[PDB]
């Protein structure tokens, strides 16, 4: 009934991947800031 805000179910049944100091790359030559 009362309006709600974001918070829909997300990765809950998954292992919950954690990225502390990890980095990702793409096809185009991209740099991490």
UniProtKB/Swiss-Prot annotation:
PTM comment text: Ubiquitinated; STUB1 likely mediates polyubiquitination of PD-L1/CD274 triggering its degradation. Ubiquitinated by MARCHF8; leading to degradation. Deubiquitinated by USP22; leading to stabilization.
Induction: Up-regulated on T- and B-cells, dendritic cells, keratinocytes and monocytes after LPS and IFNG activation. Up-regulated in B-cells activated by surface Ig cross-linking.
Cellular location(s): Cell membrane; Early endosome membrane; Recycling endosome membrane; Nucleus
Topology, Cytoplasmic side: 3-33
Tissue expression notes: Highly expressed in the heart, skeletal muscle, placenta and lung. Weakly expressed in the thymus, spleen, kidney and liver. Expressed on activated T- and B-cells, dendritic cells, keratinocytes and monocytes.
Self-association state and partner proteins as the record states: Interacts with PDCD1. Interacts (via transmembrane domain) with CMTM4 and CMTM6. Interacts with (phosphorylated) STAT3; promoting nuclear translocation. Interacts with CD80.
Entry function: Plays a critical role in induction and maintenance of immune tolerance to self. As a ligand for the inhibitory receptor PDCD1/PD-1, modulates the activation threshold of T-cells and limits T-cell effector response. Through a yet unknown activating receptor, may costimulate T-cell subsets that predominantly produce interleukin-10 (IL10). Can also act as a transcription coactivator: in response to hypoxia, translocates into the nucleus via its interaction with phosphorylated STAT3 and promotes transcription of GSDMC, leading to pyroptosis.
Pathology noted in the entry: Truncation of the 3'-untranslated (3'-UTR) region of CD274 transcripts leads to elevated expression of CD274 in multiple cancers including T-cell leukemia, diffuse large B-cell lymphoma and stomach adenocarcinoma. Disruption of 3'-UTR region is caused by structural variants that stabilize CD274 transcripts, leading to overexpression. Increased expression in tumors promotes immune evasion and tumor cell growth by allowing malignant cells to escape destruction by the immune system.
Family per record: Belongs to the immunoglobulin superfamily. BTN/MOG family.
Protein known as: Programmed cell death 1 ligand 1
Species the sequence originates in: Homo sapiens
Gene encoding the protein: CD274
